[PDB]
Structures are given as C-alpha cells and as structure tokens.
C-alpha cells in the first residue's frame, strides 16, 4: 500500500575530491516478486545526474519530465543546466504536485562546469531539499545506507577510493534489504570524465 515500498530500490550519492559518485541497485519488483533486474534509477541530462527511487511508474514519469524540461531549458538558454539549478527545478517540479505527489525520492549529483565544486542533493516526495556535502541516500534501505555511510564515509576521497566506499555502502546496505539488490550500478563523475561500473552481488 505505501507507494514508496512497492517496487523497491535504493540510490546513494557521495562527493570526494573534485568528483562525485552516485549509485543505485537494479531490482524492479512487485512486492515480493522480483520482476526485472535491469531497472537503472540513475539518469543524466548532460553532466547532471538524477537518481530516483520510489514507485517505478513515477520514477519513469519524472525522468521523462526532466528530460523534456532540461531540453527546452537548453534551447532557450543555449547552455546545459547546472546541478544547483536542476535541483531547484526538481524541487519546484515536485511541490507543484504538493497535494497528490509523485511517490519518489530524488537525488541529484553533478559538478558545476564553471566552478568545479562537486554537488549532490536530495529531496522527499514534495520538494523538501536536503543539501549536505557528505552523502545523500534514498530508497527502501535508507536506514541501512545511513548506517553504512556514516561509518564508511570520510571527506575528500579520490575517485578511485570514493568508488569503493560508495559501492560497499550500497552493497552491504542492499544486502539487508529485501526489496533491493539483484545488481548494482555506480557512476564516478569527474569534471572531464564519467565512468560507469556494474557490481557483482548476491542475486537473491
């Protein structure tokens, strides 16, 4: 019945030295039934990544909505949207539906192309913004993730290390969640380049 706990799924985002990372599991299920093990919850509009967890139809919808929006934004402004900007866009986009929300939990991650300052942020189903410099988590295993993060996390990690950290965080947290797992994807984002890796994990 809680739309936010039907399809399952988690997302996490962290910042390091001149980079940010954002990962998600791949399970799509209907209650106990695993249905697909290929449901990435991370998307990007240029150099800004949005991870969304929650009711899958909404995850899909929103993604569609932000592309549309980021697309027109690019046409009118003649430049790609920035993290900070996107963030306010997501927020305002969610509060628009304050009394009949999209049951999701978004996480933004990217690096401002001008300043180079890494950035991540998160929201609840109606736009309440959470801007922290360490990490952001969302999904059915949020509690788990916090636990892992608060312990594993330390500032200014190098891309290669942040990777491990976020993977572990994600991985072990997922292992304690019924509705999560079946695969994981991690993006390591740097000013100039972005690497995407799939993780090997328990398929149960």
């Amino acid at each position: 019945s809680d739309p936010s706990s039907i399809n399952g799924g988690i997302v996490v985002a962290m910042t390091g030295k001149d980079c940010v990372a954002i990962a998600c599991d791949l399970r799509l299920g209907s209650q106990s039934l695993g249905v697909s093990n290929k449901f990435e919850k991370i998307f990007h509009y240029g150099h800004v990544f949005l991870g969304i967890t929650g009711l899958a139809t909404d995850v899909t919808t929103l993604n569609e909505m932000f592309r549309y929006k980021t697309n027109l934004y690019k046409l009118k402004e003649e430049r790609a949207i920035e993290p900070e900007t996107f963030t306010q866009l997501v927020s305002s986009s969610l509060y628009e539906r304050r009394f009949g929300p999209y049951f999701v939990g978004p996480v933004v991650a990217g690096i401002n192309s001008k300043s180079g300052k890494p950035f991540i942020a998160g929201f609840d189903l109606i736009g309440c913004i959470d801007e922290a410099k360490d990490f952001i988590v969302s999904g059915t295993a949020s509690d788990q993730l916090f636990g892992m993060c608060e312990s594993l996390y330390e500032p200014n990690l190098e891309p290669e290390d942040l990777f491990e950290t976020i993977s572990q965080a994600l991985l072990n947290a997922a292992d304690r969640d019924a509705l999560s797992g079946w695969g994981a994807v991690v993006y390591i984002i740097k000013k100039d380049e972005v690497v995407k890796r799939y993780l090997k994990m328990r398929q149960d």
């Binding site: 990007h44 913004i129 959470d130 509690d143 312990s151 993977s167 991985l171 995407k196 890796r197 090997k200």
Partner: protein, 222 residues
Amino acid sequence: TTIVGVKFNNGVVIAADTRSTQGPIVADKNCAKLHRISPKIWCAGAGTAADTEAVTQLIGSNIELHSLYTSREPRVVSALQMLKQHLFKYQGHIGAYLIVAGVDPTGSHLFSIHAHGSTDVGYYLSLGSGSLAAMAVLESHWKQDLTKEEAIKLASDAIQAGIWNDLGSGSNVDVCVMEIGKDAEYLRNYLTPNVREEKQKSYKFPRGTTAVLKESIVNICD
C-alpha cells in the same frame, strides 16, 4: 525543531537549531531553517519543511514585487498578513509554523503564525518540538530592554534548551539579528557544540576490494 524570536531594545533576533529529521532519522545534520523574506525580514519555520520553504519563497517573491511597485522598503505586517491569508486559505494543510521577525520603517516586529492562519505578537516566542524547553528558558531569563548582546545569548541558550532536551532538535544554532539602523546579520552556525568525535578506525577500503562485472565510459557532451 526549535526556533525562537526575541525582541530587544532596538531590533529583533531569531534563531534555530539545525537538525532535519525524517521520522527518527537525522537526514540533514545541518539544514537551515532561517529564511529571508526580504533583506530585513526573516522568518524561521517548523512543520512540513517543504511547506515552510514554499510559503516563504512565495511570499518573499510577492513581497519583492510589492516593494518595487511601491518604491518602499518591505513591511512585516505585510509579510504577516500575506502568510496568514495564504495559510488560512489552505485550512491547515500547508503545515507551516513560522516566527517572522524583521525591521522596517515603522520599527521592529516579531510575530508567529500557526499553519491554520492565526498570528500572535510578543517580545519572545518559540515554536517546534523544542518549543517548551526553549520557552522554559525564555520564561526564566527574559526581561524588558535587553541589549543586542543579551538577546542573542538568550535566544541562543533557548535553542540550546531544545537541542539538549528535545530529541526533535539538535546539531547547531543559527541566529539572525535584525537591528534597526543597521543591515541584518545572519549568523550561520553561531554555535557548534555537537561535533562527532574522531572515528576509532579508518574504513578506507583497499582498492580493488569491490567486484566489478563491466566498465564503460559515459558520454556527457553533445
């Protein structure tokens, strides 16, 4: 959440803790709850955060426009009247509980608005889960004619009341002083007492610890 507004001899100060919680989980160990409506009008909010932010920005905007149109500095009673008429419009559904303070041509003001659209005025007020711990302090040390410094301390301690005695509050203290003749000064993290101690170990994993199946470069540019 704990937010207080304390009026002093020639201005008003408002402060708040910095803990945001989803249920019993500290989501943001340092969110900001002090909003600016206009340069010299700030408010602190508790309740549904998204609502306090929304109603804040919305009114701030309409306030910025009314100013431009009237070529006059913004007035607190206007911010008040606007918030109260909007909140009231939404019969309580916009869960915003606010203490709006600020200076303007007519002097200093301090009000509180409850989500149903009722307002109150006083020399000191507080709202949030820490409401009572903080009001306890205010009811013990407040006096008429506080200096700018006495009020800051007071409002500051009160927030501490809530920080220590209320599970719903914590982390740090934010202050914003609106003195009459001067510019408003927003003291972010005026107080920082809750610092996590150095972890007992390093959980820095040795590289390669994770099992990877496939690697690939993502294309960002067009």
